[PDB]
Design a binder for this molecule. Structure first.
Ligand SMILES: Cc1cn(C2CCN(Cc3cncc(Oc4cccc(Cl)c4)c3)CC2)c(=O)[nH]c1=O
Ligand SMILES: Cc1cn(C2CCN(Cc3cncc(Oc4cccc(Cl)c4)c3)CC2)c(=O)[nH]c1=O
Ligand SMILES: [Cl-]
Ligand SMILES: [Cl-]
Ligand SMILES: [Cl-]
Ligand SMILES: [Cl-]
Lengths: 190, 184
């Protein structure tokens, strides 16, 4: 079973990953985790990071260019993902394909039913063959928390919620920070 | 020996690659060739071409974004390239790193000593580890404005010895004499 944890930076994804991993293991499930982007391993991820810090000329200003780098990062990890899924009861990803849809649409001032989101779905799932998550869990935060570029983050949190409402790429759950971890594990892996 | 053939689109590189291969093989050397971008083989290459036909939103409008995709295409081929060099007497590339420098600088209205050219050299040769060609052969021949500036940037690159030794040839170059000149 493949689960993706999603949300804006500072939402608290890492803590939720840990709480859920513990809840799963307490129920007898084995768990492996993997975080995107794979900063430090993926050349495409590290070029993207450098672009975010002002390197590589005009690279970061293209929305689709940055999205492509993150997709190439995941494509490089497809064998790892499949290996974990065969070897473990539950694989939890800290960010997956939906992160690309949310930030790309937000940067373009689009919504979840717009072009950017559909482009991501086509290129990452259909073309690159990345495995679809069984669950996408949105750790949803307020506009005030998201902004703390501030506007870009706020628009990303709104797209995320739209993606969850539309069932983009599969089933979603929407949770808050202080989620009941044993209840969530029972819901995700029934 | 690694040789890269360079020039503006339509210069006739493909014909020159063919003739040069024959001259080498007629001289007793084994030869392999490889063309960049690796359209149809590279995900990064095919996205770049699609972007050139108006696809992938704003991607094609970023000069460095397009350059990065072409660099990532080559990075995907670095071992392929090294394998051919170990396996064959002569490896001829139809376009290589200098193409990225020439089109990128030209699109930025920069020259060969400007930022883009130094950036290509840095990310492709030093960081991604692409092997420096033994020879870069510029086929200099007789939007159009972009193509014109690219051919001049190309000549500047050859004049400065960018990335290694260059030869500048015209349309009627003698392929057998050029092979003899390149030959070790
Ligand atoms: C895994 C993943 C991650 N991301 C984001 C995740 C958040 N970071 C950090 C960030 C967080 N909040 C605002 C930011 O400003 C910019 C500025 C320029 C480009 C982008 Cl994509 C974002 C940047 C950027 C990549 C994607 O866009 N796509 C992905 O697929
Ligand atoms: C192998 C390679 C190739 N090229 C070019 C070669 C020429 N083609 C075709 C072309 C020829 N002449 C003008 C063009 O206009 C554009 C339009 C958009 C982007 C770019 Cl880079 C060029 C396009 C584009 C990629 C690079 O820029 N870098 C490379 O590394
Ligand atoms: Cl977070
Ligand atoms: Cl475990
Ligand atoms: Cl708020
Ligand atoms: Cl040509």
């Amino acid at each position: 079973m493949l689960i993706a944890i999603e949300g804006v930076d500072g939402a608290g994804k890492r803590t939720l990953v840990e709480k859920l991993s513990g809840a799963f293991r307490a129920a007898g499930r084995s768990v492996a985790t993997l975080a995107f982007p794979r900063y430090g391993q993926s050349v495409a991820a590290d070029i993207a990071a450098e672009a975010l810090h002002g390197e590589h000329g005009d690279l970061a200003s293209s929305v689709y260019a940055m999205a492509t780098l993150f997709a190439l990062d995941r494509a490089g990890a497809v064998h790892t993902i499949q290996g974990l899924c065969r070897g473990y009861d539950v694989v939890i990803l800290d960010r997956y394909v939906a992160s690309n849809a949310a930030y790309s649409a937000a940067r373009l001032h689009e919504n979840a039913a717009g072009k950017a989101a559909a482009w991501v779905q086509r290129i990452e799932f259909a073309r690159l063959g990345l495995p679809k998550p069984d669950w996408q869990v949105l750790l949803a935060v307020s506009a005030e928390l998201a902004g703390e570029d501030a506007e870009l983050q706020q628009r990303t949190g709104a797209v995320y919620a739209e993606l969850a409402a539309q069932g983009w790429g599969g089933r979603w759950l929407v949770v808050g920070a202080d989620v009941d971890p044993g209840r969530l594990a029972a819901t995700l892996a029934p």
